[PDB]
Design a protein around this ligand. Sequence first.
Ligand SMILES: Nc1nc2c(ncn2[C@@H]2O[C@H](COP(=O)(O)OP(=O)(O)O)[C@@H](O)[C@H]2O)c(=O)[nH]1
Ligand SMILES: Nc1nc2c(ncn2[C@@H]2O[C@H](COP(=O)(O)OP(=O)(O)O)[C@@H](O)[C@H]2O)c(=O)[nH]1
Ligand SMILES: [Mg+2]
Ligand SMILES: [Mg+2]
Lengths: 395, 395
Amino acid sequence: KAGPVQVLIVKDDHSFELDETALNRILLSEAVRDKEVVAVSVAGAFRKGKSFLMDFMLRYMYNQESVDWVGDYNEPLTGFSWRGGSERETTGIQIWSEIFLINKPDGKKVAVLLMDTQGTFDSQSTLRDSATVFALSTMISSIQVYNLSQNVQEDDLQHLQLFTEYGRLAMEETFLKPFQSLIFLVRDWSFPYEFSYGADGGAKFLEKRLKVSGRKHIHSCFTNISCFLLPHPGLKVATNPNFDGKLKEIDDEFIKNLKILIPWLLSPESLDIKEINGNKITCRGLVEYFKAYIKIYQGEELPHPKSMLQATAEANNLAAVATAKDTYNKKMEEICGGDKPFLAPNDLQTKHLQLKEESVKLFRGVKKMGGEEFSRRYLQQLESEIDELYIQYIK
Amino acid sequence: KAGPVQVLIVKDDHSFELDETALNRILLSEAVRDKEVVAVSVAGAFRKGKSFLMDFMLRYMYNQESVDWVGDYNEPLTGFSWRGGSERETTGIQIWSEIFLINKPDGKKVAVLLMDTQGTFDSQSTLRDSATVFALSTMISSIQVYNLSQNVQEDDLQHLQLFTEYGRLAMEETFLKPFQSLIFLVRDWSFPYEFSYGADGGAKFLEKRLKVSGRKHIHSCFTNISCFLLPHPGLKVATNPNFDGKLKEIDDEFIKNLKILIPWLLSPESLDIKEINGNKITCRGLVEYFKAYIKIYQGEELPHPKSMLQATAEANNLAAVATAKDTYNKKMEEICGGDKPFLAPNDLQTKHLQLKEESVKLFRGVKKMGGEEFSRRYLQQLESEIDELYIQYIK
Ligand SMILES: Nc1nc2c(ncn2[C@@H]2O[C@H](COP(=O)(O)OP(=O)(O)O)[C@@H](O)[C@H]2O)c(=O)[nH]1
Ligand SMILES: Nc1nc2c(ncn2[C@@H]2O[C@H](COP(=O)(O)OP(=O)(O)O)[C@@H](O)[C@H]2O)c(=O)[nH]1
Ligand SMILES: [Mg+2]
Ligand SMILES: [Mg+2]
């Protein structure tokens, strides 16, 4: 009892495989199934310290009220763990097997769901998958902790909007925002002199970072958006898989901020209840929603992502292809359409071949991306097109 | 004397501003101007430890033959530095003011040019600029040290190919590879248990990393391609701008690898001479080439980069736009072209409006990215297009 449980997962064959029975044996029990739920997710790439963080989340949820829940400064990090043995990189969602019930300030009794959500981003291949998982994760989650490494890279925002897009695609679309809360968690922040560790520093840094979209429609998607800056834990944590050592051996700033961060996220008040279309949700509602969403993504198709490179080339060649088709069409009409139509089912061919060739030389001569085998496909397009402009011969 | 000198730089107004006179007062002196040159560049984003590394490059080039050039383990890092005061983030190229002359194994006397090359990548805006600078940097450089942070991110490769593309655009294109040497330098590698620190570990890691393009046409571009894995220097270095402390206070692995890395790159033998079109080049040749290249990029245009998001949406809507135009065209011909042509300059309109509307409802009903204001531009396209298919009325 009490361990991590795989609930969603993409397979090699890009097949999203949900585990409904395990999804049931934890969230559909008579004990939680009727309580309104708060689902906390920690989402990011593989090997970014998500499980390390989620362990401390446990340390707090299991010793919540009381103590140095963070633990004895001189004993090792003991207890329940999401870290398994030989870690395999996987795309999907894991949840913690034990739901927590705890008491809100307003006497409410509430079910607390932790999810690890993990994606890959190693190729146009795995991207689509990851975005789909992140999309799902976020639309069943009450708080998405987007766990990012040193900064907020163009990538990270790009990817964020993307999976944000995927979510709306599967959603009705009220006059409420689609999702609840987002938290940009920046790990191993190393510029406390520019922006300070924590939420204050986060806020500011995020501000300045977001003002670089010549937008923040991320704000259209989320009711609440915050940012926390977390320090490097130190080399012992950083370079040791399965860390093991005393609290002491972790950087002191790191732990001091962890201490504000976990309760910041998980303290009874800050605990925030999942909801959809303006309606607070119950563990069971969740499961059926999760199932609903997944059902969709399986039926109708998710737009394959087109990368910056592939796309920038496609635009490069097309511009040649069009520049060329242009100077052909213009010279042709100059002498073939309007008050000009002096007939002649030959010489029509002659000027055509004459011009078509000038365009081809025009195109082919242009410096362009991707090279021969790639551009040739566009040269062909250029050709079959001016031939369609060649049915500019009627009468 | 002996400091960093700005030689290229992009301004707010995206105007590449070369400093020819400073470019002359160092590389066109009678003393270096006729010696064959080896140009070492260290290229990457802002705040990635390039100057810190280049300092140690100096420590070696100035104490080359002899000593613990790395310096007294108990004294601070003293001497010449590329670190200025208040660091402003800039896109461009800086070179070290003093060229080094040194003796190759084969008695050759040779000029050594260090460049810092720095780009930004904060927006589709700044990307193009950075790629242009990186393109230039690489085509006047003898060795490009691509200085990357924790791993090799899809970004980093994407960006790499891109600026690689830009270089060819400005190059004649022999049957030789365009560029000489590339080195993937990975900073703060934290998985020595998966791949080891240094060149051995690098090689392997790069291998496995590159086999994720379902390509490595990076290999088409470069005669030699290697990878070195470098450890985190420690928190004192990491979190202190302008580091100052004793050698001792830097992580011992880091320095031990630095010690193999600098000579690996810069030792007299490993020193490799710049060349273009198969021809060894001289400082002066370089300067005129550098100038030649820059002249080009100013005249003819560099393809603006199209991002994954913008592009993936464009493909999403177009697919709707085409699916829709399809079921219109088909139903139309079913009753309007071929052996069917039963005339009727009305009802022609009726079925048309009838079908056009069915397509629009078909399109608009489809779930798609970017939302209203964005999709509307595609709805219009859908319309003016089936109206062009509406000149399917002739006779
Ligand atoms: N640099 C850094 N390393 C961490 C952090 N947290 C954990 N690590 C280490 O990074 C490695 C991967 O950690 P893990 O939590 O399994 O990453 P996950 O796959 O995202 O869950 C382990 O060696 C951890 O000890 C952090 O905040 N910063
Ligand atoms: N994490 C890490 N930090 C470094 C490294 N080298 C330097 N730093 C620190 O990172 C900050 C920026 O360094 P700097 O060399 O000016 O980066 P640059 O703008 O790319 O030249 C400073 O506080 C350095 O002390 C490294 O290899 N890893
Ligand atoms: Mg993990
Ligand atoms: Mg610098």
